[PDB]
Amino acid sequence: NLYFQSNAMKTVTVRDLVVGEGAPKIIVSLMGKTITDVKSEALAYREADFDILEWRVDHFANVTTAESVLEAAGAIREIITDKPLLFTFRSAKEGGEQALTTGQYIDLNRAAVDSGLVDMIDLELFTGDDEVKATVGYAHQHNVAVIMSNHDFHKTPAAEEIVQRLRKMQELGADIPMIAVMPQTKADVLTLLTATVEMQERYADRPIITMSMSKTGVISRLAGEVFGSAATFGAVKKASAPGQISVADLRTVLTILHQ
Amino acid sequence: NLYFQSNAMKTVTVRDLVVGEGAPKIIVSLMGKTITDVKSEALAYREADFDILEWRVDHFANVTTAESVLEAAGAIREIITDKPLLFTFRSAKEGGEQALTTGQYIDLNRAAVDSGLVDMIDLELFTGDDEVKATVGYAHQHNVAVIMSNHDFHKTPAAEEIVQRLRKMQELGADIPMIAVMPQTKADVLTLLTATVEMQERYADRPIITMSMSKTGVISRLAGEVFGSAATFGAVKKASAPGQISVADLRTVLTILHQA
Numbered sequence: 001n002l003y004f005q006s007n008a009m010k011t012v013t014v015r016d017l018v019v020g021e022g023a024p025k026i027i028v029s030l031m032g033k034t035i036t037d038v039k040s041e042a043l044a045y046r047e048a049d050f051d052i053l054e055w056r057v058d059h060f061a062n063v064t065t066a067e068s069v070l071e072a073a074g075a076i077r078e079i080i081t082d083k084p085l086l087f088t089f090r091s092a093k094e095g096g097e098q099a100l101t102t103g104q105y106i107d108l109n110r111a112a113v114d115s116g117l118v119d120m121i122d123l124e125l126f127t128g129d130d131e132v133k134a135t136v137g138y139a140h141q142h143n144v145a146v147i148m149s150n151h152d153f154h155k156t157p158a159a160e161e162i163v164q165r166l167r168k169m170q171e172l173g174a175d176i177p178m179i180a181v182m183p184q185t186k187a188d189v190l191t192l193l194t195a196t197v198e199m200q201e202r203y204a205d206r207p208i209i210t211m212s213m214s215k216t217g218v219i220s221r222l223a224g225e226v227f228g229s230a231a232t233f234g235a236v237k238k239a240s241a242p243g244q245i246s247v248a249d250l251r252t253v254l255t256i257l258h259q
Numbered sequence: 260n261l262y263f264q265s266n267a268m269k270t271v272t273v274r275d276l277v278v279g280e281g282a283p284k285i286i287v288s289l290m291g292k293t294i295t296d297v298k299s300e301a302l303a304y305r306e307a308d309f310d311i312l313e314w315r316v317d318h319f320a321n322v323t324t325a326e327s328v329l330e331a332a333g334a335i336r337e338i339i340t341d342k343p344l345l346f347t348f349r350s351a352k353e354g355g356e357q358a359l360t361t362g363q364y365i366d367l368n369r370a371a372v373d374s375g376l377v378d379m380i381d382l383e384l385f386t387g388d389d390e391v392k393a394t395v396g397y398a399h400q401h402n403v404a405v406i407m408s409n410h411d412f413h414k415t416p417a418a419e420e421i422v423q424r425l426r427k428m429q430e431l432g433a434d435i436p437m438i439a440v441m442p443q444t445k446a447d448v449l450t451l452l453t454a455t456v457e458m459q460e461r462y463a464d465r466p467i468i469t470m471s472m473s474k475t476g477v478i479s480r481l482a483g484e485v486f487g488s489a490a491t492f493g494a495v496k497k498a499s500a501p502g503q504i505s506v507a508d509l510r511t512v513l514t515i516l517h518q519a
């Protein structure tokens with residue numbers, strides 16, 4: 001593996017895909033419980049118009065069996081050969097389906113990095129500063145990029161707190177800081193957009209991904225080009241988080257806004 | 260004429276079109292210099308998918324000749340018979356093509372109200388409280404609804420000032436307060452949306468229309484359903500203000516956003 005990054009241009013290039021330039025990139029989540037479910041999903045996804053494939057490993061039943069994880073990743077790579085693969089174990093507390101100890105989670109991500117089968121890994125900021133920082137370094141030594149993430153499924157923190165978290169992710173070495181928050185009011189949606197603008201304009205030297213979840217926050221998933229979110233999640237069959245619209249509708253809006 | 264308005268439901272119903280309910284309504288602007296132009300545009304516009312037809316009277320060369328204005332309004336009504344017609348003389352300082360004295364402007368709108376050919380008129384807030392309140396009263400006596408408008412083509416005032424102007428329009432009797440501002444930064448676009456939300460949630464007992472102009476503010480023309488702007492302007496072939504996108508693309512996005 002080998003990816004490129006330009007601090008000056010605020011871009012990260014994985015498999016020829018230039019993140020942080022032009023229209024926002026579409027990410028879709030693959031969720032399969034077993035290895036054949038993963039194969040079936042990968043086959044169905046092959047035709048969808050997305051840019052990055054996220055494997056939601058927390059949906060995989062045999063996540064604690066090293067060989068099963070490798071077989072699943074290999075199966076995805078054999079079916080989806082030309083697009084960046086992002087390895088994401090999303091913890092239950094942050095919107096996921098299972099929970100691992102810190103040691104298991106870190107070991108899991110290290111094994112994914114070692115496999116050479118994934119282009120990117122997701123690391124949750126709140127896992128711990130030292131553990132996260134060591135794992136970012138480890139990923140980079142193997143030419144694997146890192147999307148560092150944080151989520152709040154109940155509320156939207158103040159704009160300044162959102163900005164400080166995104167800056168913290170940069171500090172720890174994240175290639176692409178990412179934050180997802182839940183609006184309780186319309187103003188909360190604007191708060192997330194305000195933080196996106198402030199971060200991207202005054203502190204960022206790389207791409208960032210932000211979103212206000214739920215139907216109320218969907219505009220944050222569409223207006224990335226103007227406000228500064230480099231990527232956005234769409235749904236193929238079903239949503240991996242509240243607020244995502246179909247990949248087809250997402251592409252339609254991104255194209256209309258790019259022109 | 261006769262239009263309905265429900266303060267409790269925050270709607271205004273003109274020609275069976277319920278403004279303030281469901282997806283935002285699309286307004287397009289007809290901009291002809293002469294009768295030929297006005298007629299040609301009306302015929303072409305008949306093919307477009309829009310809800311309200313705005314006649315930008317400030318683009319009309321014979322705007323000071325009563326009979327010409329009447330002939331043009333009649334021509335538009337003959338062609339577009341199923342959509343509300345909004346009569347708008349936009350002054351040069353607020354983005355228009357001509358300028359009239361206060362007297363000429365008030366007389367122009369009273370004559371438009373008298374004609375029975377237009378469903379709505381646009382009245383600029385900065386025309387003065389006395390003249391504006393009197394003219395709103397006049398339109399209502401004739402069953403003509405009023406969109407009261409304000410524009411700032413150089414900057415975006417603070418949200419608090421934006422809200423103050425929208426509340427003032429409401430106080431003056433405007434059926435639909437409307438404001439258009441120009442962003443100098445990305446934050447300015449969000450400031451306009453902040454004001455929209457605050458007005459619609461805390462003070463409005465009727466629909467409002469808001470927009471942040473330019474390509475930078477285009478999101479304010481698309482997300483009216485979630486933030487609280489009841490209508491949005493699209494372009495048929497030429498934009499009547501910076502930031503408008505094609506009517507076809509506008510409807511496409513509004514529909515996607517309205518989807519359950």
Ligand SMILES: O=C(O)[C@]1(O)C[C@@H](O)[C@@H](O)[C@H](O)C1
Nearest residue numbers: 029088180211213233240241
């Ligand atoms: O689109 C979102 O809001 C997501 O929550 C973003 C990120 O957390 C992904 O890992 C999820 O699968 C979806």
Ligand SMILES: O=C(O)[C@]1(O)C[C@@H](O)[C@@H](O)[C@H](O)C1
Nearest residue numbers: 288347439470472492499500
């Ligand atoms: O879409 C706009 O920004 C407009 O300026 C809104 C309103 O002022 C109309 O009268 C114009 O024709 C267009």
